[PDB]
Motif scaffolding. Structure first.
Motif, PDB file in Angstrom:
ATOM      1  N   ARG B  40      14.779 -73.767 -83.234  1.00  0.00           N
ATOM      2  CA  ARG B  40      14.536 -74.863 -82.299  1.00  0.00           C
ATOM      3  C   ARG B  40      14.363 -74.386 -80.867  1.00  0.00           C
ATOM      4  O   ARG B  40      13.808 -75.127 -80.052  1.00  0.00           O
ATOM      5  N   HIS B  41      14.784 -73.160 -80.539  1.00  0.00           N
ATOM      6  CA  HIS B  41      14.678 -72.743 -79.148  1.00  0.00           C
ATOM      7  C   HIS B  41      13.260 -72.409 -78.739  1.00  0.00           C
ATOM      8  O   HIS B  41      13.035 -72.075 -77.572  1.00  0.00           O
ATOM      9  N   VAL B  42      12.280 -72.510 -79.645  1.00  0.00           N
ATOM     10  CA  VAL B  42      10.898 -72.401 -79.215  1.00  0.00           C
ATOM     11  C   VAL B  42      10.538 -73.472 -78.187  1.00  0.00           C
ATOM     12  O   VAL B  42       9.566 -73.304 -77.444  1.00  0.00           O
ATOM     13  N   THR B  45      12.036 -73.570 -72.224  1.00  0.00           N
ATOM     14  CA  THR B  45      11.464 -72.710 -71.206  1.00  0.00           C
ATOM     15  C   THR B  45      12.466 -71.619 -70.858  1.00  0.00           C
ATOM     16  O   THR B  45      13.681 -71.804 -70.993  1.00  0.00           O
ATOM     17  N   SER B  46      11.945 -70.477 -70.404  1.00  0.00           N
ATOM     18  CA  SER B  46      12.772 -69.321 -70.066  1.00  0.00           C
ATOM     19  C   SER B  46      14.077 -69.739 -69.399  1.00  0.00           C
ATOM     20  O   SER B  46      15.137 -69.175 -69.697  1.00  0.00           O
ATOM     21  N   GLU B  47      14.016 -70.746 -68.522  1.00  0.00           N
ATOM     22  CA  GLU B  47      15.192 -71.162 -67.766  1.00  0.00           C
ATOM     23  C   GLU B  47      16.096 -72.113 -68.551  1.00  0.00           C
ATOM     24  O   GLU B  47      17.318 -72.104 -68.348  1.00  0.00           O
ATOM     25  N   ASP B  48      15.531 -72.939 -69.435  1.00  0.00           N
ATOM     26  CA  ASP B  48      16.346 -73.847 -70.242  1.00  0.00           C
ATOM     27  C   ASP B  48      17.323 -73.108 -71.142  1.00  0.00           C
ATOM     28  O   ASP B  48      18.262 -73.726 -71.654  1.00  0.00           O
ATOM     29  N   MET B  49      17.103 -71.811 -71.365  1.00  0.00           N
ATOM     30  CA  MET B  49      17.723 -71.115 -72.487  1.00  0.00           C
ATOM     31  C   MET B  49      19.219 -70.866 -72.278  1.00  0.00           C
ATOM     32  O   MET B  49      19.926 -70.609 -73.256  1.00  0.00           O
ATOM     33  N   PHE B  50      19.728 -70.975 -71.042  1.00  0.00           N
ATOM     34  CA  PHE B  50      21.118 -70.597 -70.768  1.00  0.00           C
ATOM     35  C   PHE B  50      22.106 -71.585 -71.379  1.00  0.00           C
ATOM     36  O   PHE B  50      23.093 -71.184 -72.015  1.00  0.00           O
ATOM     37  N   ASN B  51      21.876 -72.887 -71.178  1.00  0.00           N
ATOM     38  CA  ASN B  51      22.666 -73.929 -71.845  1.00  0.00           C
ATOM     39  C   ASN B  51      21.762 -75.116 -72.127  1.00  0.00           C
ATOM     40  O   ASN B  51      21.866 -76.173 -71.490  1.00  0.00           O
ATOM     41  N   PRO B  52      20.858 -74.978 -73.091  1.00  0.00           N
ATOM     42  CA  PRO B  52      19.885 -76.038 -73.329  1.00  0.00           C
ATOM     43  C   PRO B  52      20.568 -77.291 -73.839  1.00  0.00           C
ATOM     44  O   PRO B  52      21.577 -77.240 -74.544  1.00  0.00           O
ATOM     45  N   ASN B  53      20.006 -78.432 -73.463  1.00  0.00           N
ATOM     46  CA  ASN B  53      20.298 -79.694 -74.137  1.00  0.00           C
ATOM     47  C   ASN B  53      19.129 -79.957 -75.079  1.00  0.00           C
ATOM     48  O   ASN B  53      18.110 -80.536 -74.694  1.00  0.00           O
ATOM     49  N   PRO B 184      30.297 -67.843 -85.811  1.00  0.00           N
ATOM     50  CA  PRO B 184      30.574 -68.772 -84.708  1.00  0.00           C
ATOM     51  C   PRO B 184      29.504 -68.830 -83.629  1.00  0.00           C
ATOM     52  O   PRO B 184      29.734 -69.435 -82.577  1.00  0.00           O
ATOM     53  N   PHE B 185      28.324 -68.277 -83.864  1.00  0.00           N
ATOM     54  CA  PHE B 185      27.344 -68.107 -82.806  1.00  0.00           C
ATOM     55  C   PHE B 185      26.576 -69.406 -82.542  1.00  0.00           C
ATOM     56  O   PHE B 185      26.608 -70.353 -83.337  1.00  0.00           O
ATOM     57  N   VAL B 186      25.909 -69.440 -81.392  1.00  0.00           N
ATOM     58  CA  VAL B 186      25.116 -70.586 -80.954  1.00  0.00           C
ATOM     59  C   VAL B 186      23.823 -70.065 -80.345  1.00  0.00           C
ATOM     60  O   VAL B 186      23.766 -68.945 -79.825  1.00  0.00           O
ATOM     61  N   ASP B 187      22.771 -70.902 -80.381  1.00  0.00           N
ATOM     62  CA  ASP B 187      21.465 -70.465 -79.893  1.00  0.00           C
ATOM     63  C   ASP B 187      21.375 -70.727 -78.391  1.00  0.00           C
ATOM     64  O   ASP B 187      20.742 -71.674 -77.915  1.00  0.00           O
TER      65      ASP B 187
END
Ligand SMILES: *[C@@](O)(CO)[C@H](C[C@@H]1CCNC1=O)NC(=O)[C@H](CC(C)C)NC(=O)c1cc2c(OC)cccc2[nH]1
Ligand SMILES: *[C@@](O)(CO)[C@H](C[C@@H]1CCNC1=O)NC(=O)[C@H](CC(C)C)NC(=O)c1cc2c(OC)cccc2[nH]1
Ligand SMILES: [Cl-]
Lengths: 303, 301
Positions: B40-42, B45-53, B184-187
């Motif tokens: 889903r992280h496709v 944007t490069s910046e959304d990736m840190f803590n996306p909603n 326990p990982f998260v995207d």
């Protein structure tokens, strides 16, 4: 990130594998255009196999003596010839899944992917190296004959190996797709020994650079060695001599890591003379020699 | 034997690989029937990736924002949904190469083949084991997410892994094909640490059975143990405890050799407590834990 023994995707070759039966013998064939290529000893019997006069046995066979099956389809053989140890069965149907391909004879120390097959059906895929003594340390069971080794460059499949034999020591022997064996072996039912094997030095060095690129440097040292002094020690340990061409081929890895090739040679020299003690490199307790520089570059470039 | 890491032939999976792009973010997807599955992280944007909603990012997306390509051929997206960490894109073409398939969630210790892909093009295939800490030791470069891991049983592809993350230590993490992470990982674009790893006991036992089948049996002792007793000891050597399923999948090898699973366990226990004493098993001073009971039979049969 990471470093693994990787094979090429096998799909283009899977679509060429067929089953070939003559009499009571069944093995795999490779279906390219309107020819099926397989080990010629499929025309043998249990008695013939100890000293087969292949030309004499082949003349006595008819096109209809060869049952070729691609899946649930029988291919009609309309011709047959022999090229060294490879039987060439002409069929009335070109394989529609034939990829762009060539036949190449690989050099010792080079790697290729093996598609192990049984009864014309692909079973597994793994990477192998042509050993300096022209054996390969494969995984082959009864019925694996005619399995092929290959590399892929772009869309082109370069076939380099067809499987024929297992030696008493458990390593394997085969031919190129022109039917010439690698090494001094012969497709007769006899126990055959290989020449003394040596370690593929340029590959060990590539693998050491891989370990560094993956952040492991415990085996490095401050020392340097001349090419000849290194080769004297390597030869003492049954390692292949390192050529200047090998040194050049390692350039990229040396540039990427900033470790001079001869500096890495000094580390390998130390590893050979002292051993690893208890330590491991990239998870191995042994010095791995079946990764080429290119193998390492393709997985570790820009990493 | 000649025990190699051996992947399944990858052709049935190659025919399912596509690329999925949102803006300039491209990764791999898996095209089965008329659905394309991808991380889903496709949509980040490069910046959304840190803590996306992701739910918020996704409500701002329409079908026409998704570029799905088989090679250079676009497949029109006609529907989209998110399931855990996986995006499902309905496309207007059913993949003619769709094999018989299922989606399975594997246990630690189980092995599978990984088809590493880049921009929808397969590049290599290798075997991995799910570590007890839910990482795999892969070989993955930029552009590799969406690559899948699978097993093949008969004519049926069981998909078990989709690639999402590299961890600081260089091991890899990802999800099953329902988008549920292993471990326990998260995207998120964040450094995430895996629990300390342990040795895969069931696979070591499979490897010992393999050694016995090959005539290498010096380490067999005349003792047996309880499963409880063994587990308590194993944990003190950073070995995984055995489950009833582990005992069960060792059944065929136990029957083949005539050595009860708990007898083999007592032999392993002695190796743990006493060491190899300068000996090897199947040529190695190291005990191998990345061959399952299936891999052993398969490579020996
Ligand atoms: C092919 O499948 C035969 O079609 C087969 C492959 C081997 C079976 C087990 N593992 C393999 O790689 N090849 C053979 O059986 C060949 C056939 C020859 C070329 C006619 N023979 C051997 O591999 C062979 C014969 C002997 C031997 O003698 C008797 C003594 C020791 C080893 C040995 N290998
Ligand atoms: C996918 O290709 C992204 O589409 C990529 C896989 C890695 C590229 C290099 N090798 C790989 O396995 N995945 C990522 O880049 C993910 C993207 C997330 C899901 C948004 N992130 C990471 O792998 C990641 C980020 C960080 C990090 O930050 C801060 C710090 C340390 C490790 C780390 N890994
Ligand atoms: Cl990263």
């Amino acid at each position: 990130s990471g470093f693994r023994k990787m094979a090429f995707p096998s799909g283009k070759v899977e679509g060429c594998m067929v089953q070939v039966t003559c009499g009571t013998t069944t093995l795999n064939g490779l279906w390219l255009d309107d020819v099926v290529y397989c080990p010629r000893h499929v025309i043998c019997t249990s008695e013939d196999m100890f000293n087969p006069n292949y030309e004499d046995l082949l003349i006595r066979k008819s096109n209809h003596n060869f049952l070729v099956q691609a899946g649930n389809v029988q291919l009609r053989v309309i011709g047959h010839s022999m090229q060294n140890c490879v039987l060439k069965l002409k069929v009335d149907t070109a394989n529609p899944k034939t990829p762009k391909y060539k036949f190449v004879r690989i050099q010792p120390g080079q790697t290729f992917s093996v598609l192990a097959c049984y009864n014309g059906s692909p079973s597994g895929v793994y990477q192998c190296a042509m050993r300096p003594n022209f054996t390969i340390k494969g995984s082959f069971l009864n019925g694996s004959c005619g399995s092929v080794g290959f590399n892929i460059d772009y869309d082109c499949v370069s076939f380099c190996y067809m499987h024929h034999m297992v030696l008493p020591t458990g390593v394997h022997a085969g031919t190129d797709l022109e039917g010439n064996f690698y090494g001094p072996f012969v497709d007769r039912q006899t126990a055959q020994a290989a020449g003394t094997d040596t370690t593929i030095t340029v590959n060990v060095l590539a693998w050491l650079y891989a370990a560094v690129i993956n952040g492991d440097r415990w085996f490095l040292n401050r020392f340097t060695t001349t090419l000849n002094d290194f080769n004297l020690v390597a030869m003492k340990y049954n390692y292949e001599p390192l050529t200047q061409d090998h040194v050049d081929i390692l350039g990229p890895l040396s540039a990427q890591t900033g470790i001079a090739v001869l500096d890495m040679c000094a580390s390998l020299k130390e590893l050979l003379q002292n051993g690893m003690n208890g330590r491991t490199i990239l998870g191995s307790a042994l010095l791995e020699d079946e990764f080429t520089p290119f193998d390492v570059v393709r997985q570790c470039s820009g990493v």
